[PDB]
Write a protein that binds this ligand. Sequence first.
Ligand code: KC2
Ligand code: KC2
Lengths: 172, 172, 226, 51, 178, 61, 100
Amino acid sequence: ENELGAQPPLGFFDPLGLVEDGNQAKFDRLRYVELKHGRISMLAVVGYLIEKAGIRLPGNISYDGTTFADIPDGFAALSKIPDAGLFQLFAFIGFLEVFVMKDITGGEFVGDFRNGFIDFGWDSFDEETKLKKRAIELNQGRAAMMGILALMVHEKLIPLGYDADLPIIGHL
Amino acid sequence: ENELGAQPPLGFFDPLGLVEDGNQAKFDRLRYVELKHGRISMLAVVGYLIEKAGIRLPGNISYDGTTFADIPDGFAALSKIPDAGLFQLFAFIGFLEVFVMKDITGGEFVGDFRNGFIDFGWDSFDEETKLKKRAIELNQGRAAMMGILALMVHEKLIPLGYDADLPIIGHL
Amino acid sequence: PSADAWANSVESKALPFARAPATLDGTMLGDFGFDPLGFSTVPVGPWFTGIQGRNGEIGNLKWYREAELIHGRIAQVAVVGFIAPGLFGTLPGNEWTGVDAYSNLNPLEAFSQVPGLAILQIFLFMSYLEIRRINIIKEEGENYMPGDLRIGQGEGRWNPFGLDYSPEAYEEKRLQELKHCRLAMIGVFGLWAQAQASGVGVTEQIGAALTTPDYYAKAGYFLPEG
Amino acid sequence: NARFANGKPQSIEAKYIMRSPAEWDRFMRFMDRYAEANGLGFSSXXXXXXX
Amino acid sequence: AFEDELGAQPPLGFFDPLGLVXXXXXXXDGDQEKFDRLRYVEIKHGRISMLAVVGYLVQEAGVRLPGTIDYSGKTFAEIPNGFAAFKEIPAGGLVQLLFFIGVLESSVMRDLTXXXXXXXXXXXXXXXTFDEETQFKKRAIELNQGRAAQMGILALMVHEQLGVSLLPXXXXXXXXXX
Amino acid sequence: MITALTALFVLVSLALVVTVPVALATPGEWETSKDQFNKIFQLWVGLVVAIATADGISTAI
Amino acid sequence: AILGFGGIYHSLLGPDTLEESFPFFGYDWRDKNKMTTILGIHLCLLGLGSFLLVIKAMYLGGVYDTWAPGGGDVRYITTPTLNPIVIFGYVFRSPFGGDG
Ligand code: KC2
Ligand code: KC2
């Protein structure tokens, strides 16, 4: 429901007035939007940090003769995957998204029944598995959502981030 | 809370009588003074052993051509960090100390609300959660606080603790 | 919907096209109604005084005012710290090893050159005037005045001088302090950006744009008196 | 000089201590009537008839 | 009128030999057989076809933005005038086209709505709107303009993959004598 | 096609230069005939737009 | 014709005095505040008009130069001179011979 999310040092923080309805129904949907951009941007920054560390796989990615080292770091990488690879992301992720295993039905308290193993679950600590850990993942997303808007704009004006760090880090 | 840190062999041990007076406050003060000294000393000897065993990171720490391998073990290390590194320690560790993550008020019965997941167990084990684990962490600090007085005053004579284990181990 | 305070909207004297979200309210001296996005509707309590105190109030600012006061006061000392090493002497360095680490006029690079024992002793003093502020936040409690290192004229705060200033002139000074606090923060951002955009200090920029640069300046006066 | 392209044309510091002191010393006489007296807008067609 | 009974106009008028608006004949009760969907889904294919046909004329006429489309070495002239023009583009370019299409699609211009958006055809944000009598005509004009482009762009799809580009289809034999 | 569109554009603007200030300086015939001049003003700019496309297309043909 | 129409508008069909129903556009000629506000509006538009040339020379298509190197040509003014002693040394120069 409500009573989750932001927290010290903000608490309920809707300062421009986008949700001040007094209606849970609009606030419900924008929460699960934030969970989803939470979950995606988190695996994209750690995807970015592991791609930028030079952590690659060995071998060719196809019979194009593109190694995993050939695919450049940064924004170009997803763009110059071969097209038939990008269909197979779509075929698998799209099944994984809209109906199987993750079902995002309608934005519904996506609970997905993947609750850790022992850890961090009901009939144990009250404070933790919800009202804290459910709050951190969202705020983890809040860090990583801002991490990509950075990262894209860091890549937009300069080359890639490892080529942003050997030369200048100061502003334009 | 009061009965803590006074398990055998020494029991309650105020030899000189500085908690001979009364109040919760100067026992509150000196406890979390003792705990934070505990927490800092414990990572500093584990920080010592992982430095002195030759576990480093390849690559320069700055533009200088100062690698992590070029930074020697011991007390030349923290001093020969470049200054802008130390001012970024004081920024982050600073924000982490006072402000982000780790609240420091007067020693507030420092709870910090995190710890693990199924682990903190009140409602499960009233003598495991506190009074044993909360007692050992104090004492592991009490070892490690006596480890860094050790760590300095050993290294004050020429071989350090990788160097002190190739030559002489005997006293002056 | 706790930030619904954009429902009633007091005039933003700052922005005559926009509005102010009614928590500004004209109580505090610095208020002229500037809140183009928010942070006024929500306050935050002092988290460093309590995990209990991490949560905040609904109308009491007190802390955005301090962060406006502390950043503004440091910035006022900072703008002199950029400008005054260029106008005056630059402290001959012969006490410890290392000669003329001070002599650099660029304040970003003179930061790195000057020995780590020197800025540490600045950091220790700039520490010591602030654990003092921790105690003054604890002792004053919820009676807290957002400035107040116990320096002022009343109470026996410290009061060295002939600080005889009347409560009307006292309201002027807090306003004059605050207006320079808001002005110096943009100044330090100016000085920090000009020291990056050119590797020189201020007196090597403003004292360079008043020169008739050598390739434009005329040769001289070679006319004879006969 | 003579097309040295000077600012308010001038080739010595000695005439800078002629421009400023002769403006100022016939300025301080003007101040001696109009010092310590401000404000008092009038909103008329060129009255400004205060003394 | 909002969207109902629009676009039925002579010499034909109303069209159901099939049964798909008769609501009981064919493909019925399977899935998403709401007529107001199909009412809309005609219009958007019409709108995309109208920009497809008109935009294709401006492409084939040689009207080109001057410069380079990327900094990996494609100028605007190097994109062919024809069907493989969406091929010869950087793929990261085609990411960006589809993305801003999707931004319109998730938020800005309708793509949840079963009717049309707010735009109200004139120029700009002023949006000179039609009032009563003329509007019943011109909303159904947009439908008939939509359908003619839907037949027109696919006609074209059949043309040059089986033939040659519109510049050689207008520089060689085309159907009649002329 | 450009020459015919600007020929109509001059002949509309003759009626505009004449009949508008005769209807502006009339105290009665503005509020009544404003929807007759709105139709022609909107038509007039909508002819400027349709003649700017014509030069725009038929230069870079 | 846009500017011609609105000039014929406010000279024939308009409020004869603006300060009845438009206080933002009305004035007294003696309101020293309001007459400076109309200055300060118009100074900004002359200011934005002057950068509009600076956008034209630096960025949008450049500006013709006869001192252009190797022949007179349209070129981009990449590095103008913003030293005020150079710039205001034109204004405080003499108006006579060769100063100019
Ligand atoms: C969503 C993650 C994902 C899943 C679940 C998945 C499943 C399977 C299965 C099912 C069990 C088979 C049998 C299979 C086989 C091939 N995959 Mg693989 N695959 C995944 C992802 C990608 C990407 C991202 C690429 C890729 C490719 C190839 C090529 C060689 C093609 C060639 O050389 O022509 C072959 C043969 C690359 C490519 O398509 O190159 C054009 C390329 O980018 N795949 N793949
Ligand atoms: C407390 C752990 C810690 C955190 C959380 C943290 C976060 C960030 C963040 C963004 C949030 C950025 C953007 C950032 C950037 C840089 N850090 Mg880093 N940083 C960490 C600490 C240290 C230390 C000890 C050093 C250091 C350095 C650099 C240099 C290179 C400067 C150069 O070589 O020019 C750059 C650019 C070294 C250094 O300052 O060299 C003079 C150096 O010793 N950092 N750092």
